Design an enzyme around this catalytic site. Structure first.
Site, PDB file in Angstrom:
ATOM      1  N   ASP A  95      42.871  45.821  44.341  1.00 42.53           N
ATOM      2  CA  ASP A  95      44.667  44.709  43.680  1.00 42.53           C
ATOM      3  C   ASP A  95      43.567  43.555  42.787  1.00 42.53           C
ATOM      4  O   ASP A  95      42.709  43.153  42.842  1.00 42.53           O
ATOM      5  CB  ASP A  95      44.691  43.869  45.706  1.00 42.53           C
ATOM      6  CG  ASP A  95      46.458  43.217  45.020  1.00 42.53           C
ATOM      7  OD1 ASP A  95      46.913  43.280  43.915  1.00 42.53           O
ATOM      8  OD2 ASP A  95      46.136  41.804  44.907  1.00 42.53           O
ATOM      9  N   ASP A 111      45.581  41.823  49.678  1.00 39.92           N
ATOM     10  CA  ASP A 111      46.078  39.995  50.013  1.00 39.92           C
ATOM     11  C   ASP A 111      47.533  40.168  50.592  1.00 39.92           C
ATOM     12  O   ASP A 111      47.738  39.625  50.595  1.00 39.92           O
ATOM     13  CB  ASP A 111      45.455  38.748  48.979  1.00 39.92           C
ATOM     14  CG  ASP A 111      46.404  39.074  47.361  1.00 39.92           C
ATOM     15  OD1 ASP A 111      46.516  39.905  47.284  1.00 39.92           O
ATOM     16  OD2 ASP A 111      46.816  38.078  47.149  1.00 39.92           O
ATOM     17  N   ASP A 121      50.107  46.020  49.923  1.00 44.80           N
ATOM     18  CA  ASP A 121      48.192  46.675  50.000  1.00 44.80           C
ATOM     19  C   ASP A 121      48.502  47.119  51.655  1.00 44.80           C
ATOM     20  O   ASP A 121      47.105  48.106  51.878  1.00 44.80           O
ATOM     21  CB  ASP A 121      47.179  45.356  49.716  1.00 44.80           C
ATOM     22  CG  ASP A 121      47.497  44.824  48.736  1.00 44.80           C
ATOM     23  OD1 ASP A 121      47.245  45.614  47.636  1.00 44.80           O
ATOM     24  OD2 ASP A 121      46.842  42.944  48.372  1.00 44.80           O
TER      25      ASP A 121
HETATM   26 MG   LIG Z   1      47.383  40.602  45.684  1.00 45.42          MG
END
Ligand SMILES: [Mg+2]
Ligand SMILES: *[C@@H]1O[C@H](CO)[C@@H](O[C@@H]2O[C@H](CO)[C@@H](O)[C@H](O)[C@H]2NC(C)=O)[C@H](O)[C@H]1NC(C)=O
Ligand SMILES: CC(C)CCC[C@@H](C)[C@H]1CC[C@H]2[C@@H]3CC=C4C[C@@H](O)CC[C@]4(C)[C@H]3CC[C@]12C
Ligand SMILES: *[C@@H]1O[C@H](CO)[C@@H](O)[C@H](O)[C@H]1NC(C)=O
Ligand SMILES: [K+]
Ligand SMILES: [K+]
Ligand SMILES: [K+]
Lengths: 992, 268, 39
Positions: free
Chosen positions: A345, A686, A690
């Site tokens: 990410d 995070d 995700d």
């Molecule tokens: Mg993120």
């Protein structure tokens, strides 16, 4: 089952307000009927998320209890009890032998069960985190009245009201809104507020303004909406089910463990029944034939090995805990080292997740600000009179403030009340010009026009801090072109000068360059208002332009971006040097995604996408050879219409990949794509977007500080300080432990041969039993333990970050080369050393080796209390037995003595001990404690009863010494050959 | 094949042949040096045979000799091992001045035939007549157990001195030259009868020290016949035959350490 | 000696055990010293 969930969603944001009421039997104004709502409740079910069905803890413990070694050890334990039953019925034995050994062996199974259970952990509360995102209550309009209700009682169709501060209770169609902005970071990983209005504004329901989603929250304003989806059926509710529902699957390390279990279980059953038949052919009774088989079981099964693996893994996990890297699942220690692809990410992972000033254009010059957290770069300028004028507008024409009591924390880390851009500027000036509050005090604001949708600028009028003026200064900021159309002069190096087309083009050049860097650009200008036209008491009207807003002086441009974390660029470089492929997978827009890709080294300098070639060459994209482009940037909208076969091609054909504007399911798909090519993949993230990707990843890694609760639930590892450098450390540690486990396995296995061979020679030679069954467990569960563990503390023999990732299909934890070395070579030398000591004890007590062949019939016979030795002397039963058990004890000690050299040789797979040295203090601790244990077992009073361990005479300790030395030399000579010729013979035959 | 090619299967065979060859050679080497450090006449250690064992001729099933007088094939098992031992004490076996010697017919003192050396030929052992074993096909009813003290090189069995009290209080106390043997059970429903050299209930000291198989093949150790002509029948009788002496000790674990455990049953 | 050669059938297993246990302990202490050179 979950394949439906892996697909993008279909919606009804396209319908009119009226049309949407038809679809749900609903009123736009009055809302549902208390009766119609309750009806639709019993129809559809609760606005709730149901946790997936789990395998209970009972079955998880018991599934380990039947795994290869445990099965053979069960066959052992039961066959002990069988032999004890056969004895208890026939000749009344007052002995405890087969009873106690059956009790001991079943405990070994149970305790080994705990170790493997501890290693096979699954701390998963994904669906719990999602449930936390539904509010306790919702505000609904029913029978023309607003009332708060248990949010679970919310049904498709009723009218819901939301305001700044509250979570969106279900998926809504916006029918009415006033200044409503929403935080869609759950869907996108991006927290910048998104406006909500009743108007449809994109065919994509995930991009249109007239939908608001469950798992997001209203940030400001007010909205009313029609519930389109509830519970499981919501956009993010589906993600919840997807994430919670995905099958975990086996880790690389676990697959390796099972693999050698089969090899060793294989050789165990081979020799097991191979010598069970070989005994009955030689004419052994079924009473005896089990006792030898039990021996063979205990001989072949490395009883302490699985526990060793667990402790080695644990000790590696402790080191990483000590570098702020928390490991939830023990096996995840290794996986990072086996990783060939990282899907990462961007926002909050590669980047800081904080709009930061990156560059400034003033004095016809591009300057660059330091974007790092800890501010690791250098100063750009301080000297110029222009800078201070620009700095002043940046502080003055700004409405952002630091939250109370942040004085303690650093400037870039402290919370700011205000929009991202104003925060950025605040932090920028506070950093290089000290207290901004200071500046805003010295120059009191009298009137301001806040930033308008219509104006596209924000202006302020301030009392000038100068004594000699104390007069009125106008400062304004906004869209770079709009600021330019309000200027006449340019503050170059101090003094103003006319806006010549020359400078106007230089501005556009500066503007396009900064915009090209994926950065958000603002214009900055001031105007010192003429003294004679503006009294110290002069009144300014903000509502009607009471003052000129044209012919002002352009001071500068400033550009900003959510910048990389300081350690990220180098971390990515290092991952790539280790031959790991690094892919960006983000919900963010492509221009931004691409710019960071270059910044962190996902896209290396000079590499191009098809679109880059086309623009450079000024030719259509259809005309570009796609094989000429090593880099690609795929939008989620395009990815949506591609089959998996086409995604695989994208993956195969590009080295430098950026998947931008991806949905949560889409990130999972990319992960699965990578996995399908046979790669071990790590995900770093995070956000709640995700979670499916982190779940499917061979190893998911979450950000500790920045990370959402969902993300850290889905991960196998948490970086507690957000230090991306830890990934590099993690892969290095993962690699190191893999080699060190081989070393430890080799060491543990080697000592099997000197435990097997006595039992075989017992049968084939008819000699007294050289070593007992009890004695074998004293090695595997006693003396070998601390030495085997200690190999986990071995440093690398070479730069492991210089080699490619292991091929999990070819590079096994335990191969033929290890077996050839442990079983065929070193262990064989160990067996002889053991035998030698056996022959020594017996010969020195009167039974010469020659007379020992075929003596067991007379030896074991309890009723012959006069066995004749070589010298003509006569022995009772217990007398000769004491000698025999002394032989067991000295055989045992001989193993310890040869395990000394084995420990030292297992220290290195390639290098010399003279190269690697003896700096492993745990290993040395192993040597001393191992010998202390053995000595304790021999000499402690009562151990002759409990374990049949007899005192050894000093000379007895030195029997195996020449064998211990031969091991050390042999192996040192062999590894000398490896190094001297990388070619292959010794290498391809013995190199673990 | 399973692993490798034809060429590679050969190289691994040529290796493991040479390797294991060398290993066998080294192992053999170490046994040679071990043997080189040892005597032909005496073992390096003797503390594990230390206090001698007492062993008997009837091959005890489980330290037990149970049989029927009214049965022929009930005792034919025990007579085999009984004959086995006594068959060795034959006079035809003890022929000529070489290597045997007539010694005192009454128990005598030790005989030292020099040192544990090959500086003389075979050391000459005292003869033992089986005819010394009075009353003992053997004792078909009420058995004739034959006792034996386990041979130990350079061992001089020393009887206790009659300074204070003794179990068989001073009776026929040939204090100087007899190592005694008494059999016991309270529970006294037996009939103890002892046959030996010179009629004594012991082992004559003139058969000592033993010089070993290498220096005294054909040597004969003294025997002691015990006959239990008990006026009882059809029950398990636990009888312990114990030897007494300065060098003679016993153990709770080793139930043969200078003693017997005989479970006689004349279940007729 | 001649008839008084009882020492030939004796071994001091008591001292051996004492010495052995001393050594075991000392090697155990030594190990701790080496291990605790930094924890
Ligand atoms: Mg993120
Ligand atoms: C040892 O002594 C016994 C004494 O009984 C010998 O037994 C003789 O065996 C033959 C043939 O079976 C009989 O005819 C005799 O009656 C037995 N006794 C005697 C006194 O001659 C036995 O054969 C001897 N064994 C050896 C190897 O010498
Ligand atoms: C007690 C003694 C007599 C038994 C000795 C067992 C011997 C024959 C065994 C034990 C270990 C074995 C080796 C282990 C490793 C390999 C690698 C494999 O890819 C092919 C066979 C080969 C090369 C084996 C050949 C046979 C071997 C040397
Ligand atoms: C043993 O036999 C002799 C004859 O040889 C006889 O006088 C004596 O009664 C017997 N002794 C016993 C105890 O039966
Ligand atoms: K084992
Ligand atoms: K995972
Ligand atoms: K082992």
């Amino acid at each position: 089952l979950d394949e439906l969930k892996k697909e993008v969603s279909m919606d009804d944001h396209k319908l009119s307000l009226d049309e949407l009421h038809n679809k749900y039997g609903t009123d736009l104004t009055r809302g549902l009927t208390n009766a119609r709502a309750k009806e639709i409740l019993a129809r559809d079910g609760p606005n709730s998320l149901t946790p997936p069905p789990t395998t209970p803890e009972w079955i998880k413990f018991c599934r380990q209890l039947f795994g290869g070694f445990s099965i053979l050890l069960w066959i052992g334990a039961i066959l002990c009890f069988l032999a004890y039953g056969i004895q208890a019925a026939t000749e009344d034995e007052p002995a405890n032998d087969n009873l106690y050994l059956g009790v001991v062996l079943s405990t070994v199974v149970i305790v080994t069960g705990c170790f493997s259970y501890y290693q096979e952990a699954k701390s998963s509360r994904i669906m719990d985190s999602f449930k936390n995102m539904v509010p306790q209550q919702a505000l609904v309009i029913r029978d023309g009245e607003k009332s708060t209700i248990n949010a679970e009682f919310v049904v498709a169709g009723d009218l819901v009201e939301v305001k700044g501060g509250d979570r969106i209770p279900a998926d809504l169609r916006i029918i009415s809104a006033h200044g409503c902005k929403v935080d869609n970071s759950s869907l996108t990983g991006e927290s910048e507020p998104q406006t909500r209005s009743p108007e449809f504004s994109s065919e994509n329901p995930l991009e249109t303004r007239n939908i608001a989603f469950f798992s997001t929250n209203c940030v400001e304003g007010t909205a009313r909406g029609v519930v389109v989806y509830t519970g499981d059926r919501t956009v993010m509710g589906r993600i919840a089910t997807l994430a919670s529902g995905l099958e975990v699957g086996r880790t690389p390390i676990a697959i390796e463990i099972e693999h050698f279990i089969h090899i060793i279980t294989g050789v165990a059953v081979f020799l097991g029944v191979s010598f069970f038949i070989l005994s009955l052919i030689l004419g052994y009774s079924w009473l005896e034939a089990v006792i030898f088989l039990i021996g063979i079981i205990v001989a072949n099964v490395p009883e302490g090995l699985l526990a060793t693996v667990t402790v080695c893994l644990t000790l590696t996990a402790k080191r990483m805990a000590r570098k702020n890297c928390l490991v939830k699942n023990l096996e995840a220690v290794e996986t990072l080292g086996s990783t060939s692809t990282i899907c990462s990410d961007k926002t909050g992972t590669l980047t800081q997740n904080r709009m930061t000033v990156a560059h400034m254009w003033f004095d016809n010059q591009i300057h660059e600000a330091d974007t790092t957290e800890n501010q690791s770069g250098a100063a750009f300028d301080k000297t110029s009179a222009t800078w201070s004028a620009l700095s002043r507008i940046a502080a003055l024409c700004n409405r952002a403030v630091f939250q109370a009591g942040q004085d303690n924390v650093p400037i870039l880390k402290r919370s700011v009340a205000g929009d991202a851009s104003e925060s950025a500027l605040l932090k920028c000036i506070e950093l290089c010009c000290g207290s901004v509050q200071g500046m805003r005090d010295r120059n009191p604001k009298i009137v301001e026009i806040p930033f308008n949708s219509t104006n596209k600028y924000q202006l302020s009028i301030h009392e000038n801090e100068k004594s000699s003026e104390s007069r009125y200064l106008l400062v304004m900021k906004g869209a770079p072109e709009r600021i330019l159309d309000r200027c006449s002069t340019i503050l170059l190096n101090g003094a103003e000068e006319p806006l010549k087309e020359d400078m106007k083009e230089a501005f556009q050049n500066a503007y396009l360059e900064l915009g090209g860097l994926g950065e958000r650009v603002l214009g900055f200008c001031h105007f010192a208002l003429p003294e004679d036209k503006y009294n110290e008491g002069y009144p300014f009207d903000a509502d009607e332009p009471n003052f000129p807003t044209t012919d002002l002086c352009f001071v500068g441009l400033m550009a900003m971006i959510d910048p990389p974390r300081a350690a990220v660029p180098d971390a990515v470089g290092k991952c790539r040097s280790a031959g790991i492929k690094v892919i960006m997978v983000t919900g963010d827009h492509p221009i931004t995604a691409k710019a960071i890709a270059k910044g962190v080294g996902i896209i290396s300098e000079g590499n191009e996408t098809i679109e880059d070639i086309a623009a450079r060459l000024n030719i259509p994209i259809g005309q570009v050879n796609p094989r000429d482009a090593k880099a690609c940037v795929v939008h989620g909208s395009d990815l949506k219409d591609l089959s998996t076969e086409v995604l695989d091609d994208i993956l195969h054909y590009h080295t430098e990949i950026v998947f931008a504007r991806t949905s949560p399911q889409q990130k999972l798909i990319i992960v699965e794509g990578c996995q399908r090519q046979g790669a071990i993949v790590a995900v770093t993230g995070d956000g709640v977007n995700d979670s499916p990707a982190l779940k499917k990843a061979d190893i998911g890694v979450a950000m500790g500080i920045s990370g959402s609760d969902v993300s850290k639930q889905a991960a196998d590892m948490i970086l507690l300080d957000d230090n991306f450098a830890s990934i590099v450390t993690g892969v290095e540690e993962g690699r190191l432990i893999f080699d060190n486990l081989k070393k430890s396995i080799a060491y543990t296995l080697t000592s099997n041969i000197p435990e097997i061979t006595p039992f075989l020679v017992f049968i084939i030679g008819n000699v007294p039993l050289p070593l007992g069954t009890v004695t074998i467990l004293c090695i595997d569960l006693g003396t070998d333990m601390v030495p085997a563990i200690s190999l986990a503390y071995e440093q690398a023999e070479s730069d492991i970050m210089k080699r490619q990732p292991r091929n999990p299909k070819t590079d096994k934890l335990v191969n033929e080369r290890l077996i050839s070395m442990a079983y065929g070579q070193i262990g064989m030398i160990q067996a002889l050393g053991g035998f030698f000591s056996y022959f020594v004890i017996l010969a020195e007590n009167g039974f010469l080796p020659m007379d020992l062949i075929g003596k067991r019939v007379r030896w074991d016979d309890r009723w012959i209390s006069d066995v004749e030795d070589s010298f003509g002397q006569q022995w009772t039963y217990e007398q000769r037995k004491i000698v025999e058990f002394t032989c067991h004890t000295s055989f045992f000690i001989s193993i310890v003595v040869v395990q000394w050299a084995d420990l030292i040789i297992c220290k290195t797979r390639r290098n010399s001990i003279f190269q690697q040295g003896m700096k492993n203090k745990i290993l040395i601790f192993g040597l001393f404690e191992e010998t202390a244990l053995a000595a304790f077992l021999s000499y402690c009073p009562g151990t002759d009863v409990a374990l049949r361990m007899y005192p050894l005479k000093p000379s007895w300790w030195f029997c195996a010494f020449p064998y211990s030395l031969i091991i050390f030399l042999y192996d040192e000579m062999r590894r000398f050959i490896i190094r001297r010729s990388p070619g292959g013979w010794v290498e391809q035959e013995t190199y673990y | 094949f399973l692993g490798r090619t034809g060429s590679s299967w050969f190289k691994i065979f040529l290796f493991y042949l040479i390797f294991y060859g060398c290993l066998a050679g080294i192992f053999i080497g170490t046994i040679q040096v071990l043997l080189l450090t040892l005597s032909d006449f005496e073992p390096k250690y003797q503390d594990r045979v230390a206090p001698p064992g007492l062993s008997h001729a009837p091959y005890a099933i489980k330290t037990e000799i149970s049989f029927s007088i009214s049965n022929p094939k009930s005792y034919e098992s025990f007579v085999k091992s009984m004959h086995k031992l006594m068959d060795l004490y034959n006079e035809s076996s003890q022929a000529g001045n070489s290597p045997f010697e007539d010694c005192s017919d009454t128990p005598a003192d030790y005989i030292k035939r020099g040192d544990l050396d090959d500086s003389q030929g075979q050391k000459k052992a005292c003869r033992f007549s089986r005819m010394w074993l009075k009353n003992c096909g053997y004792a078909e009813g009420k058995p004739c157990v034959v006792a034996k003290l386990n041979r130990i090189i350079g061992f001089y069995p020393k009887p206790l001195k009659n300074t204070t009290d003794l179990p068989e209080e001073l009776q026929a106390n040939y204090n100087q030259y007899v190592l005694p043997l008494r059999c016991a059970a309270r529970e006294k429903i037996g009939s103890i009868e002892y046959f030996g050299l010179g009629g004594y209930a012991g082992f004559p000291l003139q058969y000592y020290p033993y010089y070993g198989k290498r220096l005294q093949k054909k040597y004969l150790q003294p025997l002691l016949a015990i006959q239990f002509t008990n006026l009882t029948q059809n029950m398990e009788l636990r009888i312990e035959c114990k030897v007494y002496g300065e060098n003679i000790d016993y153990s709770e674990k080793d139930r043969f350490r200078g003693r017997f455990e005989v479970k006689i049953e004349v279940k007729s | 000696e001649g008839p008084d050669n009882d020492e030939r059938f004796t071994y001091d297993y008591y001292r051996l055990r004492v010495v052995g246990l001393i050594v075991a302990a000392v090697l155990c202490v030594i190990g701790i010293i080496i291990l605790l050179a930094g924890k």
